[PDB]
Amino acid sequence: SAIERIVKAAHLIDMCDIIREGNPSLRTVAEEVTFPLSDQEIILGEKMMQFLKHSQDPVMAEKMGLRGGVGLAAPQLDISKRIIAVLVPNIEAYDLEAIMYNPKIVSHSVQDAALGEGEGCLSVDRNVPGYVVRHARVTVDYFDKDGEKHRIKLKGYNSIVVQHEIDHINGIMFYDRINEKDPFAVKDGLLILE
Ligand SMILES: Cc1cccc(CCCN(O)C=O)n1
Ligand code: NI
């Protein structure tokens, strides 16, 4: 059981826990968690955030051989649960830090947005050029470990990151949103962030 081994006290999430393309799990719609959460469900979220902080640490990232990142979804650990972790550093320390249970986009802008540098994925061991078209702004509802509801508004980079992770729990990959015909096509209403 992936969740049972990953949540053991001694376990450190590393690249070996992250599944890659082809694995059916990355294309499966994850199941909602129920409240109250089990200890394992709480621990899993904490382990996920620990991974992100480790991956963003020069020394630690080097020792563990981790790929830098600002987001992780449970399905990437082969755990089909609607749990995601996001950690964007200030360029107080982190501009955004959150472990989200059952996250959901409840509102979004007509305007679209895409990072000018494109996107990558820990589960994708290759580069796929192109603008990943997403919503410019999103209002997201989620629950914390205590079953408390949160409603936040995101824009710019953070909006992109959270949408990338929510896609994972819905079986969607970043390249699914890249225009096939022309990868770098700039449509009306699309904001390129850089
Ligand atoms: C700059 C940027 C934009 C969107 C998502 C991520 C995180 C990539 C790691 N990953 O594969 C998470 O699921 N980084
Ligand atoms: Ni990803």
Q: Domains in the chain and their CATH numbers? A: 1-194 (3.90.45.10)
How far apart, in Å, are the Cα atoms of 111 and each of 107, 108, 129, 141, 159? 12, 8, 22, 20, 12
Instruction: Tell which residues of the chain come right before a gap with C–N over 2.5 A.
Output: 91
What atom of ligand 1 comes closest to residue 120's alpha carbon? 8
**Looking at residue 13, what DSSP letter applies?**
-
Ligand 1 mean position, distance from CA 187 (Å)? 23
**Positive or negative torsion for Cα 118, 156, 162, 182:** negative
Q: CB–CB of 50/26 below 8 Å?
A: no
Q: Using alpha carbons only, how large is the chain's radius of gyration in Å?
A: 16
**From CA 168, how far away is CA 27, in angstroms rounded?**
8
164 labelled binding-site residue = yes
Instruction: List ligand 1's pocket residues with C-beta within 6 A.
Output: 69-73, 76, 115, 119-123, 160-161, 164-165, 168
Amino acid code (one letter) for 46:
E
What's the rounded Cα separation, in Å, for the pair 3 and 58? 27
64 Cα distance to chain centroid = 20
CB 73 within 8 A of CB 56: no
Ligand 1 atom nearest to 67, measured from its CA = 9
Told to judge if 165 belongs to the known catalytic residues of this protein, a careful annotator would answer: yes
